[PDB]
Structures are given as structure tokens and as C-alpha cells.
């Protein structure tokens, strides 16, 4: 028995690391991607004549700014799994908690994408708000 | 010089369908646990006096099956991008192909589960709707 293991351990944190980094980019793109969409959709199809645009431009920054940070805390979590791993390879405490770590980052994630959607609509007159529900419907369903 | 390549290539068949294999599980979950715990959520704090719990009942098990039916398709697009890359590993017309029918399954999954939560909703007494939207910003914000 040798330093094998010390490093066969450390091949596979560096491993796990690389997987879920690529992870974390599918998981940063499966909440941008209809975002981005839905965001289009509002300046599309709700108008903003009494200047709501100045408000939710500023909205937006704040939700960039949070994203941001989110996907810097599943970057994070994602490293203490991967140097979790590369001590003991196997279903440990450490590796439980670590796992429900990554898995709380990318709900969060998901989570505030959603709040800033609902927190969008409430920054608007209630005429534009009417007809942001009317395209919301019409574009989910078809 | 050797059959070093028809295993090279086989690693890189296997690492894709670890990263696959991950990704699909955190499909599955990023859509599956928050409609679970938001159905809970349903029946501890709306009521159903008029017998709302007869039709939602009906509208679940017609969600479920859908919910089955993509999911079967998420697994074929996996299973046909593993083969696909098994062929010839690189960014061919046939990965191009499979690559962008893995994400639509994805995104399929997720539309269809956020389609059916506000169809939930939907079949509700008023008194009671205004019950369930309540009960959501105090959960998703906190
Ligand atoms: C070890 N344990 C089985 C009690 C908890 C680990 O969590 P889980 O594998 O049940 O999700
Ligand atoms: C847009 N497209 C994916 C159909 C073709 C563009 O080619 P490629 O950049 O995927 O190689
Ligand atoms: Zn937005
Ligand atoms: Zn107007
Ligand atoms: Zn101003
Ligand atoms: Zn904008
Ligand atoms: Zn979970
Ligand atoms: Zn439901
Ligand atoms: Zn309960
Ligand atoms: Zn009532
Ligand atoms: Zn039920
Ligand atoms: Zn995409």
C-alpha cells in the first residue's frame, strides 16, 4: 500500500470538478434561455408610457447582479464536492451534505429567476399588467 | 500504432454519458420536486367546498402521463446522442441534431410542468385562487 490512492482520490475530485462545472453551465442556461425570452416578450408586446421602462431597466441590473452571485455560491459548492470526493470516495456525511449543497445553489438559482419575473409585473401600471398576462398565455399554451 | 483510439474514443463515449446521466437527473428534479412540494402546498392551504378536489384530481393524472410521456423522449434523445458520439466523436450534423433534441425534451418538460401549475389554478373557485396566489408569494420570496 502506497500514496496511490492519495492521488488516485485527487484524479477523481478533479474528475467530478470538470463534470460539474459543464453541469453548471446546462443549469446557468436552463433558466437564462426563457428569461431572455420572456423578456423580449415583454418589450414586444407591453408598451410603457408612463416610463416603467426607467424602473425595470434598473430591476433587471439588480436580478443580473443576484444571478451573478448565486452562480458564484453553485461554483463553490460544486469545488467542496469535488475536494469532498477526492478525500473519501463513497456516500460519506461529507458527501450527503455537499450534494444537498449544489442541489439548494441551483434551486435558489431557479427560484430567483422566477421571484424577478413576478417582481417585473409588479413594477407596471395595471393596463400593461392585464396584457402582459394576455401574452403570457397565449405564448405558453401554442 | 494500436486500438488506443478505439478506447480513447470509448472514454469519451463513457464521460458524455456521465455528464448526460447528471444533467438528466437534475432535469428530472428541477421540475419534479418544486411541483410536489407547491401540490402539498395546494392541499394545506386551499380549500375545496365546492369540490374542486374531483376535477384536480382528474387534471394531475392527465399531467402525470404527459409528464411520463416526456420523459420517455428525454431518455430516447440521450440514449440516441450516447450512439450518436459512439459513431463518430465530434461535432457532426448527426451530434448537431441530437444535441438540440436532448435540450427541447428539457425544456418541453419544464413548459409543460409550468403550463399545468397555472392550469391547477385555473380550475379554482375565485375565493379560493386568491387563497393559492397568496400562499405562493409568501413560499417563493421567503
Ligand atoms: C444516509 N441516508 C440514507 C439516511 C440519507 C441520505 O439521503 P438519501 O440518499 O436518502 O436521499
Ligand atoms: C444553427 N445550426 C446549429 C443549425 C447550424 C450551425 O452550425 P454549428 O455552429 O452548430 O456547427
Ligand atoms: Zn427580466
Ligand atoms: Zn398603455
Ligand atoms: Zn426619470
Ligand atoms: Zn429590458
Ligand atoms: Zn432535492
Ligand atoms: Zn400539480
Ligand atoms: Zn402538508
Ligand atoms: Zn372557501
Ligand atoms: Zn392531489
Ligand atoms: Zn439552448
Same mark, same amino acid.
Given at each position: 500500500?502506497?500514496?496511490?490512492?492519495?492521488?488516485?482520490?485527487?484524479?477523481?475530485?478533479?474528475?467530478?470538478?470538470?463534470?460539474?462545472?459543464?453541469?453548471?453551465?446546462?443549469?446557468?442556461?436552463?433558466?437564462?434561455?426563457?428569461?431572455?425570452?420572456?423578456?423580449?416578450?415583454?418589450?414586444?408586446?407591453? !408598451?410603457?408610457?408612463?416610463?416603467?421602462?426607467?424602473?425595470?431597466?434598473?430591476?433587471?441590473?439588480?436580478?443580473?447582479?443576484?444571478?451573478?452571485?448565486?452562480?458564484?455560491?453553485?461554483?463553490?459548492?460544486?469545488?467542496?464536492?469535488?475536494?469532498?470526493?477526492?478525500?473519501? !470516495?463513497?456516500?460519506? !456525511?461529507?458527501?450527503?451534505?455537499?450534494?444537498?449543497?449544489?442541489?439548494?445553489?441551483?434551486?435558489?438559482?431557479?427560484?430567483?429567476?422566477?421571484?424577478?419575473?413576478?417582481?417585473?409585473?409588479?413594477?407596471?401600471?395595471?393596463?400593461?399588467?392585464?396584457?402582459?398576462?394576455?401574452?403570457?398565455?397565449?405564448?405558453?399554451?401554442?
Amino acid at each position: 500500500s502506497r500514496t496511490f490512492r492519495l492521488s488516485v482520490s485527487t484524479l477523481v475530485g478533479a474528475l467530478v470538478g470538470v463534470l460539474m462545472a459543464i453541469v453548471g453551465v446546462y443549469v446557468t442556461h436552463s433558466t437564462e434561455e426563457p428569461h431572455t425570452s420572456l423578456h423580449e416578450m415583454l418589450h414586444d408586446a407591453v !408598451p410603457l408610457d408612463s416610463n416603467e421602462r426607467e424602473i425595470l431597466e434598473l430591476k433587471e441590473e439588480e436580478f443580473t447582479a443576484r444571478r451573478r452571485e448565486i452562480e458564484s455560491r453553485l461554483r463553490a459548492a460544486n469545488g467542496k464536492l469535488a475536494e469532498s470526493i477526492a478525500k473519501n !470516495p463513497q456516500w460519506s !456525511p461529507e458527501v450527503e451534505e455537499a450534494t444537498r449543497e449544489v442541489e439548494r445553489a441551483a434551486a435558489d438559482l431557479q427560484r430567483a429567476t422566477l421571484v424577478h419575473v413576478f417582481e417585473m409585473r409588479a413594477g407596471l401600471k395595471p393596463e400593461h399588467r392585464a396584457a402582459y398576462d394576455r401574452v403570457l398565455v397565449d405564448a405558453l399554451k401554442r
